Ligand binder design. Structure first.
Ligand SMILES: OC[C@H]1NC[C@H](O)[C@@H](O)[C@@H]1O[C@H]1O[C@H](CO)[C@@H](O)[C@H](O)[C@H]1O
Ligand SMILES: [Ca+2]
Ligand code: NA
Length: 708
């Protein structure tokens, strides 16, 4: 057959999944499986999920489906289906497999290290649950402080486990560490930082994990073979993972807890964004077992195409498209979230993503979306389709994309990671730097500044602190290098937080978070076969290893000692003044941005009217490619801001002359120590010169010239 002919003939638009009705008394089951000869539901005990309690056949229905009603008449010995578990038994040409219901609302505790025992253990078992009845009943969409449209968002990227896995805070947690409800206890920190949106790394069920050990601390340094998972191996798109639950064996508990966490985010004036991973599953069979050669993108001969060890969901195909859309709609409606971040959004066709936006916006008119817009489309063989990537930005003002051009130009990025760049001693085309800061990157067309997600660090790759230390080749274990890296960190964060577009902050990017592999047996280089997986070894200018030379660049499979957010470094001004200085700088930066809409203009036409480059490349001691930059915004209220950056290692002068002499009785809103929306009484790192203005080495400033 062909997915195209199968859509023509078995396209189905009714409800899917298991609806727990009648306060537990009844379950209506629907599963799309056109090719099946028989379908039964195997029901597993809620007290012992290994225990099969009975097996009920389903009967054929409309357009390829199979339907059944579990009720009073069951021989199962069940009067309340709540919390019982199920999988689908599907027989085709005499062979039987057990399948996960793709519309499962929750799941039994899952442990992939037991997957080999039998068929029943190869995929998760779904749970009969009713989301609506669970958690805070007053939960609704966020009402987000300081936020009106996408350009207004400040996005903060956190993993649920990392945010509370620091043993250093065990003393202050009343909830089990690294769970949804533990996350709630550190929310006051994020409200004080001033971010509008917390983007959570994938919370939907993922495959490679033993959830039954989720309370064990991963205190040993490791970067491969860890029970920790970022979660980029999807198993189900409606069910939450049990890894962040106080009890993975209670199928309802993760729902209440998540609903309560989204509610707490909301009450603090912030929104939640959900990292979602629709481009690939963890295993080809997750959907191949459901309906052969349909769900995935495929070669011409119907072979499923593959990504990260699993299958590529072909969102061009009717049931796969609706899987994506129903999941989006269900997550927005059930958990009342404020947005989504699409993983490898370029793997998807534009139309799917567009319709996902429209359906999510129909539920929550203030929802935003961004994704990875890399040009990666693979699709069906011989069926080119317009993709939801960077080149799509010129045909839509809906879902924004990450900017690799600013990331690459400022510190490093693929394919030149670790090479000196704007904030790391490597000079850059000044026009290019400026075009990035006004949210016109040079590697794709952004016809609105809200198309652009501006970032210099994320969960992927070396953290901002780590990348800078690698790039300038200075070992942070020397007080003077530590201080220099921070000076550079602040510079970068200033550049992003004052740029047009939507700024994105990796959790910890505010304090100088590191993923240095500080294992006691790894103070110095070790033999080849013991080198930590996903590491880089860091060296100084003479080529001598760093003290603890190995640092992790892909921590998807690393332990708490690698992945924990460091609370002491982030909050203890006495024990770590540089880190806390950095954190306070970010806080002021976000406050600065939020005090005016000069940094967050709403159109391309308005950006070109109001922002003008001051450091013209070539002129006044400013090389065509350099490590300095200066520019001006005329705000909508007529105030005039200027941003000046000196990422050089010597004092450097910015020429003002008569054209920009009005910048002289400016108030200074940021300097080398601090940032904020209010004038710094005694500004440091600035000197007024005859020609214009002198900035100390590794120093940035923001000015505002009022007439008021
Ligand atoms: O989902 C694949 C990748 N998409 C971009 C994300 O930001 C990445 O973190 C993600 O990759 C990570 O997860 C995969 C799948 O488990 C792993 O193989 C990668 O090495 C890891 O970076
Ligand atoms: Ca656009
Ligand atoms: Na890197």
């Amino acid at each position: 057959t062909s997915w195209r002919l199968k859509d023509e003939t078995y396209s189905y638009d009714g409800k899917l999944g298991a609806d727990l009705k009648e306060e537990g008394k009844q379950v209506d089951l629907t599963l799309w499986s056109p090719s099946a000869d028989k379908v039964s539901v195997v029901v597993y005990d809620k007290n012992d999920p290994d225990k099969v309690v009975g097996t009920v056949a389903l009967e054929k229905g409309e357009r390829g489906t199979w339907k059944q009603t579990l009720d009073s008449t069951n021989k199962l010995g069940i009067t309340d289906f709540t919390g019982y578990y199920y999988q689908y038994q599907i027989e085709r040409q005499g062979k039987t497999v057990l399948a996960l219901d793709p519309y499962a609302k929750s799941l039994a505790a899952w442990n992939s290290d037991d997957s080999k025992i039998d068929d029943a253990h190869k995929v998760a078992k779904a749970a009969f649950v009713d989301p609506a009845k669970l958690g805070p009943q007053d939960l609704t969409y966020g009402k987000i402080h300081n936020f009106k449209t996408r350009e207004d968002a400040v996005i903060y990227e956190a993993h649920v486990r990392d945010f509370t896995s620091d043993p250093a805070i065990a003393k202050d947690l009343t909830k089990p560490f690294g769970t949804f409800e533990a996350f709630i206890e550190k929310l006051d920190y994020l409200k004080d930082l001033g971010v509008t949106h917390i983007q959570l790394l994938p919370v939907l069920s993922y495959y490679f994990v033993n959830e039954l050990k989720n309370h064990e601390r991963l205190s040993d340094y490791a970067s491969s073979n860890s029970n920790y998972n970022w979660g980029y191996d999807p198993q189900n798109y409606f069910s939450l993972t049990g890894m962040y639950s106080s009890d993975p064996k209670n199928p309802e508990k993760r729902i209440a807890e998540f609903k309560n966490l989204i509610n707490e985010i909301h009450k603090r004036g912030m929104g939640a964004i959900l990292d979602v991973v629709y481009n690939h599953t963890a295993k080809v069979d997750l959907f191949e077992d459901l309906e052969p050669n349909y769900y995935h993108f495929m070669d011409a001969d119907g072979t499923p195409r593959t990504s990260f060890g699993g299958g590529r969901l072909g969102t061009t195909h009717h049931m796969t498209k609706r899987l994506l859309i129903d999941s989006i709609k269900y997550l927005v409606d059930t958990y009342k979230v404020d947005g989504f971040r699409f993983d490898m959004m370029g793997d998807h066709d534009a139309a799917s993503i567009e319709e996902a936006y429209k359906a999510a916006r129909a539920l929550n008119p203030n929802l935003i979306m961004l994704g990875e817009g890399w040009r990666t489309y693979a699709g069906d063989e011989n069926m080119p389709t317009k993709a939801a990537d960077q080149d799509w930005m010129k045909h839509t003002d809906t879902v924004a994309v990450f900017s690799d051009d600013i990331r690459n130009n400022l510190k490093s990025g693929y394919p030149n990671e670790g090479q000196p760049a704007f904030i790391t001693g490597g000079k850059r085309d000044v026009n290019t730097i400026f075009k990035n800061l006004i949210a016109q990157p040079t590697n794709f067309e952004a016809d609105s500044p809200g198309d652009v997600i501006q970032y210099i660090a994320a969960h992927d790759d070396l953290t901002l602190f780590d990348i800078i230390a690698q790039s300038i080749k200075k070992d942070p274990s020397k007080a003077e290098n530590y201080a220099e890296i921070h000076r550079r960190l602040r510079l970068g964060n200033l550049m992003v937080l004052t740029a047009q577009g939507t700024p994105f902050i990796h959790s910890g990017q505010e304090y100088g978070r590191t993923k240095q592999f500080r294992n006691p047996a790894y103070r110095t280089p070790v033999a080849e076969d013991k080198v930590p997986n996903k590491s880089h070894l860091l060296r100084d200018k003479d080529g001598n290893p760093f003290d603890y030379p190995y640092f992790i660049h892909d921590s998807y499979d690393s332990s708490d000692a690698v992945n924990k957010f460091d609370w002491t470094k982030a909050t203890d001004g006495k024990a770590y003044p540089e880190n806390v200085k950095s954190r306070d700088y970010m806080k002021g930066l976000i406050a600065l941005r939020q005090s005016t809409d000069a940094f967050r203009l709403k159109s391309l036409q308005d950006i070109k009217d109001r922002v003008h480059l001051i450091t013209v490349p070539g002129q006044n001691g400013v090389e065509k490619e350099d490590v300095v930059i200066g520019y001006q915004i005329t705000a909508p209220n007529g105030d005039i801001y200027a941003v000046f950056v000196n990422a050089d290692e010597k004092a450097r002068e910015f020429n003002l002359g008569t054209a920009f002499a009005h910048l002289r009785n400016a108030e200074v809103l940021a300097d080398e120590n601090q940032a904020g929306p209010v004038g710094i009484a005694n500004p440091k790192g600035l000197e007024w010169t005859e020609k214009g203005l002198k900035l100390n080495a590794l120093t940035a400033t923001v000015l505002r010239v009022s007439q008021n």
